[PDB]
Amino acid sequence: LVKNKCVNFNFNGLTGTGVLTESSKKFLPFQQFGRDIADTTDAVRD
């Protein structure tokens, strides 16, 4: 996991380009992805 750089992440079949930082969000057991106001993914369980 190359961190803090512009990369292609491909997490569990979801691909894209971005930067990864730790989060304090808590997910229910049936959730893995999270979407914000613009509906794009922001939080991913690793």
Partner: protein, 236 residues
């Protein structure tokens, strides 16, 4: 073996309403600080609900599973144990049985010859069964009063169950408030369901159960910072 409980009072339903009860999560996505508008099948706000008592009177009548059922149970002694869903409720068609014993739940999709009056005690429900397509064993759904709420929906070959459990006060009446049920199970059954009966243990210890019907409506739902539903509006 089957026996007929002679000596009960005739079943008579009372009536109340489901004020802001029965709203379930429609998606498996984490949203926070957002308000969303949704379409679907929901239990209308302030809707008429039927009331049944299990106190020498046992209420186990055949009801009509139209589009989805909201089933609430107020109980301190766990009298209510399970359900049966089907159409003919004979051995000519396939039925779904959900029964909770002390430790686990048992789900079965077979051809059952249900008795004229099903009740637990032994297991005096069906004379015999055959051609079991599906079998499941999990953990008890039902592991002073305690309110247990369920939503049973039958969509696209899948039986979907959403549940919630809260300890309430001795006022057995369906509390006025807001509830947000959470997904529980999806059973691949692939059957036709138009009727259902409730399974009641008899020793009779007090219990009460309320039934409501889902209708097609639009709802406005609210999410908080932590990602849980906290308020909703019935547009119609």
């Amino acid at each position: 073996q089957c026996v007929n409980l002679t000596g009960r009072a005739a079943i008579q339903p009372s009536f109340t309403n489901s004020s802001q009860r029965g709203v379930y999560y429609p998606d498996t996505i984490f949203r926070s600080n957002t308000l969303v508008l949704s379409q679907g099948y929901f239990l209308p706000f302030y809707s008429n609900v039927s009331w049944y008592y299990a106190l020498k009177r046992v209420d186990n009548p055949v009801l009509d599973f139209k589009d989805g059922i909201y089933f609430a149970a107020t109980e301190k002694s766990n009298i209510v144990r399970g359900w049966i869903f089907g159409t003919t409720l004979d051995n000519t068609s396939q039925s779904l049985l959900i029964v909770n014993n002390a430790t686990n739940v048992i789900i079965k999709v077979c051809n059952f010859q249900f008795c004229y009056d099903p009740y637990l005690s032994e297991f005096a429900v069906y004379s015999s069964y055959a051609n079991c397509t599906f079998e499941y064993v999990s953990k008890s759904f039902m592991l002073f009063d305690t309110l247990r709420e369920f939503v049973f929906r039958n969509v696209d070959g899948y039986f979907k169950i959403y549940s919630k459990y809260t300890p309430v006060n001795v006022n057995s009446n369906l509390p006025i408030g807001f509830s947000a049920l959470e997904p529980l199970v999806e059973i691949p059954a692939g059957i036709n369901i138009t009727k259902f009966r409730t399974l009641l243990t008899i020793h009779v210890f007090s219990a009460a159960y309320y039934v409501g019907y889902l209708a097609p409506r639009t709802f406005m739902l609210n999410y908080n910072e932590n990602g849980t539903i906290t308020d909703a509006v019935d547009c119609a």
